[PDB]
Design a protein around this motif. Structure first.
Motif, PDB file in Angstrom:
ATOM      1  N   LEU A 145      44.091  50.137  47.616  1.00 17.12           N
ATOM      2  CA  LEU A 145      43.244  51.566  47.245  1.00 17.12           C
ATOM      3  C   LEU A 145      44.277  52.686  47.161  1.00 17.12           C
ATOM      4  O   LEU A 145      45.497  52.364  47.364  1.00 17.12           O
ATOM      5  CB  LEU A 145      42.584  51.666  48.362  1.00 17.12           C
ATOM      6  CG  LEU A 145      41.698  50.542  48.882  1.00 17.12           C
ATOM      7  CD1 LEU A 145      40.909  50.862  50.295  1.00 17.12           C
ATOM      8  CD2 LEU A 145      40.698  50.005  47.828  1.00 17.12           C
ATOM      9  N   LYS A 146      43.837  53.678  46.654  1.00 19.16           N
ATOM     10  CA  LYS A 146      44.643  54.843  46.479  1.00 19.16           C
ATOM     11  C   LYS A 146      43.640  56.230  46.418  1.00 19.16           C
ATOM     12  O   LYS A 146      42.512  55.865  46.408  1.00 19.16           O
ATOM     13  CB  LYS A 146      45.383  54.753  45.151  1.00 19.16           C
ATOM     14  CG  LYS A 146      44.619  54.174  43.984  1.00 19.16           C
ATOM     15  CD  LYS A 146      44.968  54.761  42.711  1.00 19.16           C
ATOM     16  CE  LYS A 146      44.445  53.746  41.404  1.00 19.16           C
ATOM     17  NZ  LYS A 146      43.256  53.201  41.945  1.00 19.16           N
TER      18      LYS A 146
ATOM     19  N   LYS B 202      45.852  49.522  52.010  1.00 23.04           N
ATOM     20  CA  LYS B 202      46.694  50.638  51.851  1.00 23.04           C
ATOM     21  C   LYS B 202      47.460  50.259  50.300  1.00 23.04           C
ATOM     22  O   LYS B 202      47.885  51.021  49.680  1.00 23.04           O
ATOM     23  CB  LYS B 202      47.708  50.640  52.910  1.00 23.04           C
ATOM     24  CG  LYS B 202      47.320  51.997  53.681  1.00 23.04           C
ATOM     25  CD  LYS B 202      47.454  51.660  55.035  1.00 23.04           C
ATOM     26  CE  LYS B 202      49.026  51.712  55.732  1.00 23.04           C
ATOM     27  NZ  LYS B 202      49.000  52.506  56.880  1.00 23.04           N
TER      28      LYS B 202
ATOM     29  N   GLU C  27      41.161  55.488  49.609  1.00 26.64           N
ATOM     30  CA  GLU C  27      42.017  54.802  50.427  1.00 26.64           C
ATOM     31  C   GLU C  27      42.085  55.520  51.763  1.00 26.64           C
ATOM     32  O   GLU C  27      41.823  54.984  52.897  1.00 26.64           O
ATOM     33  CB  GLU C  27      43.502  54.914  50.070  1.00 26.64           C
ATOM     34  CG  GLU C  27      44.493  54.027  50.680  1.00 26.64           C
ATOM     35  CD  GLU C  27      45.815  54.413  50.599  1.00 26.64           C
ATOM     36  OE1 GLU C  27      45.924  55.471  51.735  1.00 26.64           O
ATOM     37  OE2 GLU C  27      46.570  54.106  49.922  1.00 26.64           O
TER      38      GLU C  27
END
Ligand SMILES: [Ca+2]
Ligand SMILES: [Ca+2]
Ligand SMILES: [Ca+2]
Ligand SMILES: [Ca+2]
Ligand SMILES: [Ca+2]
Length: 318
Positions: free
Chosen positions: A70-71, A67, A75
């Motif tokens: 990633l985005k 979390k 994510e």
């Protein structure tokens, strides 16, 4: 009969995988490719074992780390893939209810397409996880016959599949005919009881008999007789009785068919069904929409998000 697109990995080594994920995140930047390549090649049960090994080896939380690295949709996709199977549906449900607004689309979709057996497990997991009763929650956020139909479904009390009783099939078809087309207004209560409690095999025969009797498919009457959420719900119920894979293959198409993309639905359906009947959903998609699910995602998505999606779904031809 039913087939998903993701299975258990043969030479699985939770420890080996955990180290690969660590290296993939350690330092500056992230190796999103190594992450997505690994996670979409392991069953959900194996992903839980990996998160376990990761914690014992590094004392860090795998999901919380990702979390952080990633985005965007990627994510959100990976975070959904990490969610334990027996908890995902309950998780989506809790989040469709919670807040000031409710996502009826999610409620309708999950409650209508899930079997009684699945409904019972979802209710358990929901209660133990959020310390609340699913029914009590739905009731509180809904109303009218829509709420009623959902409660009927939440009972997971659908009649069992037994030898079909022709006279009973006739009785039910004529009953629906009289409750809808032949009535000034509608007797929603009758639709709810018949659609919500009769066995699957029985209703399939009722749908055909009703067509012979009225000249209308039950779907057309529903659209003619009802409106709003109740209409959508009843359509969802009829669709699923006919074929869950086909109904799910349809909600996917409409999630992409539009200009943009309903990533929430795309993620939800692909992930939730990856190990159940995603292979069946694929066939029904091509059969009914001319294109394979693959090519459709390929053009509506992008990035590692698009890559992970196609790896989970797979199959360029269906
Ligand atoms: Ca990093
Ligand atoms: Ca983030
Ligand atoms: Ca009417
Ligand atoms: Ca309508
Ligand atoms: Ca599009």
């Amino acid at each position: 009969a039913l087939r998903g697109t993701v299975t258990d990995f043969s030479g699985f080594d939770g420890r080996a995988d955990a180290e690969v994920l660590r290296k993939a995140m350690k330092g500056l930047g992230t190796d999103e490719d190594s992450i997505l390549n690994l996670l979409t090649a392991r069953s959900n049960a194996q992903r839980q074992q990996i998160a376990e090994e990761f914690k014992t080896l590094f004392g860090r939380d795998l999901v919380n780390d990702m979390k952080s690295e990633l985005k965007g949709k990627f994510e959100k996709l990976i975070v959904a893939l990490m969610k334990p199977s027996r908890l995902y549906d309950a998780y989506e449900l809790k989040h469709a209810l919670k807040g000031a607004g409710t996502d009826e689309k999610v409620l309708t979709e999950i409650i209508a397409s899930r079997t009684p057996e699945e409904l019972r497990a979802i209710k358990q997991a929901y209660e133990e996880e959020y310390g609340s009763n699913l029914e009590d929650d739905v009731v509180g956020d809904t109303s009218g016959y829509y709420q009623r139909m959902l409660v009927v479904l939440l009972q997971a009390n659908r009649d069992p599949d037994t030898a079909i009783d022709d006279a009973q099939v006739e009785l039910d078809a004529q009953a629906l005919f009289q409750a809808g087309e032949l009535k000034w207004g509608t007797d929603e209560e009758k639709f709810i009881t018949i659609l919500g409690t009769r066995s699957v095999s029985h209703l399939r025969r009722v749908f055909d008999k009703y067509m012979t009797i009225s000249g209308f498919q039950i779907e057309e009457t529903i659209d003619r007789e009802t409106s709003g959420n109740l209409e959508n719900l009843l359509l969802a119920v009829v669709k699923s009785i006919r074929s869950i894979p086909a109904y799910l293959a349809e909600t996917l198409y409409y999630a992409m068919k539009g200009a943009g993309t309903d990533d929430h639905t795309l993620i939800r359906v692909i992930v939730s069904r990856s190990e159940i009947d995603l292979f069946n959903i694929r066939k029904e998609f091509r059969k009914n929409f001319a294109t394979s699910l693959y090519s459709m995602i390929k053009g509506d998505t992008s990035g590692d998000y698009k890559k992970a999606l196609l790896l989970l779904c797979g199959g360029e031809d269906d």
